[PDB]
Amino acid sequence: QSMRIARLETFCNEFVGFVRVTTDSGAQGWGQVSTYNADITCTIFHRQIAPHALGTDALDFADTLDLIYERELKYPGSYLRRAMTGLDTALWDMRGKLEGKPVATLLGGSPGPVRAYASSMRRDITPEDEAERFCRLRDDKGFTAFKWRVGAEAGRDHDEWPGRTEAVVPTVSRALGDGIEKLVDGNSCYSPARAIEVGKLLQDNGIGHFEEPCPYWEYDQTAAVRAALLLDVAGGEQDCEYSSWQLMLDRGAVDIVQPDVMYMGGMHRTLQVCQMAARAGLPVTPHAANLSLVTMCTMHLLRAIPNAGKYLEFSIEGPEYYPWQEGLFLGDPYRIEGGQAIVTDAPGWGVEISPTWLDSATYQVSER
Amino acid sequence: MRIARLETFCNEFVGFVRVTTDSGAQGWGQVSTYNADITCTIFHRQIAPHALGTDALDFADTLDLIYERELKYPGSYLRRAMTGLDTALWDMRGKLEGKPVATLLGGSPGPVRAYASSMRRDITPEDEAERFCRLRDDKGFTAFKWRVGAEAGRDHDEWPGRTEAVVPTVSRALGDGIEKLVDGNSCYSPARAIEVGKLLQDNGIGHFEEPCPYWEYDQTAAVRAALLLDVAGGEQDCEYSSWQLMLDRGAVDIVQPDVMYMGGMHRTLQVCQMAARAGLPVTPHAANLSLVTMCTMHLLRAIPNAGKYLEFSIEGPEYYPWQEGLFLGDPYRIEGGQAIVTDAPGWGVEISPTWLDSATYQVSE
């Protein structure tokens, strides 16, 4: 039997906003807006997403997300997308629970394991400290791929401190040893000449993935780096509109595309990027930088797409660095064994948001 | 001289910004209209923390820095907020120097020819024609823009036959000697925009705005290639990467940045220099009588590659109730189809104290 959206609810703090969708049948599901400035994003959700989605088809909604952008066509770019994600993800979870299927199954895949890479978010850490914590994760959790940071974020060629990059690259790589894949992210730091310099040191050290080596909005700079290096230049975390994915691909900027489900506007839109990459003959290694729902959406997506890259981004930062992601979910949905996460048979996203966190979150509702 | 304080005053529709320097020098700007309340929350969250304490007299690089610190946030809302900083600072420096902003930018005070711009699709051809004839005769406008298709309508018109009727009805009413423009607001596929464009050219319309979805640069380019009239666009482009793709695909004959959607005067100047390198004129978008229109007037008095005319919204206080009484005096007075940038320092505008008194207030310092 067919059904329409009846109610959309958000529960937020500054860091995270969950969305609950209710159909005319009473069927429910839970999703999430992009993390960060989540409170502004939920104000936006109720202003600019909910009015267009109420009363629409709860089970076939790809066209509705296009209609939303057409009605709000004055607002291209990140915050509309950040908000749209909360609608898309709640509806996949809704349909998954109604059908008794994980979202990965709805998408043509199936539950199972996903190989992960251990991802450090920090530049404030020393080479020795990064190496030591990586060694422990390699030995105790079985990770066999690791990503750390070079340069300074949007640093205009300046390093985090002088000599950090020169040290962090060989130090972490020699500690991790043979048989381990290595990735680094420059987060927009370098001009192409310097990124090529740094990129030859990465190659000497066996690092096969150099993410966002140049300002991400200078596509020709990134393409210059990709043309000169043999390692894979990867990028796209902050790209959220199809026109910029297009220019990226047209210019041959990257070897590997890295949309982020939550910055993109949700699964339908990320799938559109994967299919653009597939046409260009490129793998998808999505960005997921915290243990909000973004990591579980990424896992379901990697279980389903035909052109997945090597691994899931898995943030290894603890409660000291993301205190706000502790207690979001019940159970242990992000358990790692042998360097792998698991998509279970549980319907929808397979995760249960704790009622403790919901209880003291900011509530807002739209209905009719 | 460093930036010491930034205040916003808003409702849902508009938000003004007051900047104060360490010297006490002040200026007033405005964030983009629409959802202005959300924009001002953003301004305090993501613009003000980066701008407090920096050089109030040389701030082009500080706007680039802000984007770099907020790099996860590309696209409209960040720029809507950033215009507030940019415009308040230009007004501030115009007041310190006793010069109009137009003068700071290399131009001077003086008249700007305007086009009367209708925002409505819910108006009949006869009614549109009738109000335009009155504006033509009473206010001296010699150029007019009206609407075709339905906004983002996927080839559907507002009602069947509206475009077929409104094009010749308004053009015949307006008569000889009058420049004519329409805006498709992203309605059409290229084939259909071409058909419509042939009707426009039959009726002497020389400006076809945003014939296809603005984000389909190749469709827009196919339309431009096939028609002899000028295809214009770019109102919703706020990042350089998208303007650069637009210019690369040869999408448009004429660029139409909006100062407030762009993130303000420095960034819109950057678009003007991109267009000037591509050999194209700039006819900016300004769709209401908030401060956007006056910013555009100063920019048109200064740039070397201006198009023919200032977009001038002719909708009355019944369509835009919130813009009535924003400013003292009559800054948007039209005579002979021309607006005037005066010799008054900064933007040359005073915001209503009563409006500010009732506004939502927020401060960062």
A111 plus A253 within the same structural domain = yes
A152 plus A259 within the same structural domain = yes
Which residues in chain A have Cβ-Cβ distances shorter than 8 Å to B261? Answer: 74
A33 plus A115 within the same structural domain = no
Tell me the two tokens of residue B97: 């120097």
Interchain contact B214–A (C-beta under 8 A): yes
Residue B110 to residue B343: CA distance in whole angstroms = 8
Which residues in chain B have Cβ-Cβ distances shorter than 8 Å to A241? Answer: 75, 215
Residue B78 to residue B118: CA distance in whole angstroms = 28
A153 plus A66 within the same structural domain = no
**Measured between CA atoms, how close is B91 to chain A, in angstroms?**
26
B326 plus B295 within the same structural domain = yes
Tell me which residue range forms the domain holding A161. 101-354
One-letter amino acid at B269 equals L
Among the listed residues A248, A301, A293, the one whose alpha carbon sits nearest the alpha carbon of residue A85: A293
Interchain contact A263–B (C-beta under 8 A): yes
Residue B177 to residue B180: CA distance in whole angstroms = 10
Residues 6+ apart with CB under 8 A from B116: B132, B135, B136, B139, B141, B143, B144, B145, B312, B314, B337
- Locus of tokens 């358990």: A335
Q: Which of A76, A78, A243 sits opposite B245 (nearest CB)?
A: A243
Residue A71 to residue A108: CA distance in whole angstroms = 31
* Cα R_g (chain B), whole angstroms: 20
**Measured between CA atoms, how close is B259 to chain A, in angstroms?**
14
**Measured between CA atoms, how close is B291 to chain A, in angstroms?**
18
Mutate to test the interface with B, among A73, A189, A364 (most CBs of B within 10 A): A73
What's A135-157 look like in SS3? HHHHHHHCCCEEEEECCCCCCCC
Tell me the two tokens of residue A131: 């190496």
Cα dihedral A130, A185, A159, A227 sign: positive
Residues 6+ apart with CB under 8 A from B55: B1, B2, B3, B62
Note whether B76 contacts A73, CB cutoff 8 Å. no
Residue A244 to residue A269: CA distance in whole angstroms = 13
A308 neighbors A257 (Cβ within 8 angstroms): no
Method of determination used here: X-ray
Which residues in chain A have Cβ-Cβ distances shorter than 8 Å to B245? Answer: 243, 246-247
One-letter amino acid at B231 equals V
Which residues in chain A have Cβ-Cβ distances shorter than 8 Å to B217? Answer: 243
Give the experimental resolution in Å. 2.0
A277 neighbors A267 (Cβ within 8 angstroms): no
A7 plus A108 within the same structural domain = no
Residue B350 to residue B363: CA distance in whole angstroms = 20
B258 plus B346 within the same structural domain = yes
Interchain contact B261–A (C-beta under 8 A): yes
Question: CA dist A145 to A119, A165, A200, A311, A313, Å?
Answer: 9, 19, 20, 8, 10
Note whether B75 contacts A241, CB cutoff 8 Å. yes
Residue A2 to residue A138: CA distance in whole angstroms = 48
Q: Which of B72, B78, B186 sits opposite A73 (nearest CB)?
A: B186
Which residues in chain B have Cβ-Cβ distances shorter than 8 Å to A219? Answer: 241
Tell me the two tokens of residue A71: 């009605």
A89 plus A175 within the same structural domain = no
Please tell me which residue of chain A has the smallest CA distance to B248: A247
Residue A245 to residue A282: CA distance in whole angstroms = 12
Among the listed residues B296, B327, B305, B325, the one whose alpha carbon sits nearest the alpha carbon of residue B101: B296
Strand partners, A117: A313
Question: What are the backbone angles phi and psi of residue A203, rounded to the nearest 5°?
Answer: -60, -45
Interchain contact A44–B (C-beta under 8 A): yes
Q: What is the CATH number of the domain that holds B49?
A: 3.30.390.10
Q: Which of A48, A78, A247 sits opposite B75 (nearest CB)?
A: A78
Pairing of strands A112-119, A312-315: parallel
Interchain contact A245–B (C-beta under 8 A): no
A20 plus A127 within the same structural domain = no
CB pairs under 8 A between A and B: 87
Residue A289 to residue B166: CA distance in whole angstroms = 53
Stated length of chain B:
365
What's chain A look like in SS3? CCCEEEEEEEEECCCCEEEEEEECCCCEEEEECCCCCHHHHHHHHHHHHHHHHCCCECCCCHHHHHHHHHHCCCCCEHHHHHHHHHHHHHHHHHHHHHHCCEHHHHCCCCCEEEEEEEECCCCCCCHHHHHHHHHHHHHHHCCCEEEEECCCCCCCCCCCCCCHHHHHHHHHHHHHCCCCEEEEECCCCCCHHHHHHHHHHHHHCCCCEEECCCCCCCHHHHHHHHHHCCCEEEECCCCCCHHHHHHHHHCCCCCEECCCHHHHCCHHHHHHHHHHHHHCCCCECCCCCCCCHHHHHHHHHHCCCCCECCCEEEECCCCCCCHHHCCCECCCCCCCECCEEEECCCCECCCCECHHHHHCCEEEEEEC
Note whether A217 contacts B236, CB cutoff 8 Å. no
Q: Which of A40, A70, A246 sits opposite B41 (nearest CB)?
A: A40
A64 plus A106 within the same structural domain = no
Among the listed residues A50, A48, A44, A63, the one whose alpha carbon sits nearest the alpha carbon of residue A20: A50
Count of other CB atoms within 10 angstroms of residue A180: 18
Q: What is the CATH number of the domain that holds A185?
A: 3.20.20.120
Residue A76 to residue B46: CA distance in whole angstroms = 18
Question: CA dist A277 to A162, A210, A262, B168, B220, Å?
Answer: 37, 18, 18, 46, 24
Q: Is A33 exposed, middle or buried (0-12, 13-18, 19+ CB in 10 A)?
A: buried
User: Most distant CA pair in chain A: distance in Å?
Assistant: 64
Count of other CB atoms within 10 angstroms of residue B353: 9
Which residues in chain B have Cβ-Cβ distances shorter than 8 Å to A246? Answer: 245
Note whether B239 contacts A216, CB cutoff 8 Å. no
Residues 6+ apart with CB under 8 A from A154: A187, A188, A189, A215, B68, B69, B71
Which residues in chain A have Cβ-Cβ distances shorter than 8 Å to B69? Answer: 154
- Locus of tokens 């403790």: A356
A288-312 burial by CB neighbour count: b if 16+ within 10 A, else e? Answer: bbbbbbbbbbbbbbbbbbeebbbbb
What's chain B look like in SS3? CEEEEEEEEECCCCEEEEEEECCCCEEEEECCCCCHHHHHHHHHHHHHHHHCCCECCCCHHHHHHHHHHCCCCCEHHHHHHHHHHHHHHHHHHHHHHCCEHHHHCCCCCEEEEEEEECCCCCCCHHHHHHHHHHHHHHHCCCEEEEECCCCCCCCCCCCCCHHHHHHHHHHHHHCCCCEEEEECCCCCCHHHHHHHHHHHHHCCCCEEECCCCCCCHHHHHHHHHHCCCEEEECCCCCCHHHHHHHHHCCCCCEECCCHHHHCCHHHHHHHHHHHHHCCCCECCCCCCCCHHHHHHHHHHHHCCCECCCEEEECCCCCCCHHHCCCECCCCCCCECCEEEECCCCECCCCECHHHHHHCEEEEEC
Tell me the two tokens of residue A13: 């703090």
Interchain contact A240–B (C-beta under 8 A): yes
A23 neighbors A3 (Cβ within 8 angstroms): yes
Tell me the two tokens of residue B136: 């033509």
Question: CA dist B288 to A244, B308, B313, Å?
Answer: 29, 19, 5
One-letter amino acid at A12 equals C
A81 plus A33 within the same structural domain = yes
Residue A120 to residue A135: CA distance in whole angstroms = 13
Note whether B71 contacts A216, CB cutoff 8 Å. yes
Residues 6+ apart with CB under 8 A from A213: A186, A189, A190, A192, A195, A198, A199, A222, A225, A233
Mutate to test the interface with B, among A37, A44, A72, A74 (most CBs of B within 10 A): A74
Please tell me which residue of chain A has the smallest CA distance to B217: A243
Mutate to test the interface with A, among B73, B155, B186, B249 (most CBs of A within 10 A): B73
- How many domains is chain A built from? 2
Interchain contact B245–A (C-beta under 8 A): yes
Strand partners, A284: A257, A308
Among the listed residues B325, B312, B356, B335, the one whose alpha carbon sits nearest the alpha carbon of residue B119: B312
Note whether A70 contacts B239, CB cutoff 8 Å. no
Among the listed residues B268, B322, B277, the one whose alpha carbon sits nearest the alpha carbon of residue B296: B268
Note whether A263 contacts B73, CB cutoff 8 Å. no
Question: What are the backbone angles phi and psi of residue A285, rounded to the nearest 5°?
Answer: -125, 90
Question: What are the backbone angles phi and psi of residue B152, rounded to the nearest 5°?
Answer: 45, 45
Please tell me which residue of chain B has the smallest CA distance to A246: B245
Cα dihedral B189, B190, B191, B195 sign: positive
B42 plus B106 within the same structural domain = no
Tell me the two tokens of residue A5: 């959206």
Pairing of strands B310-313, B230-233: unpaired
Cα dihedral B125, B126, B131, B137 sign: positive
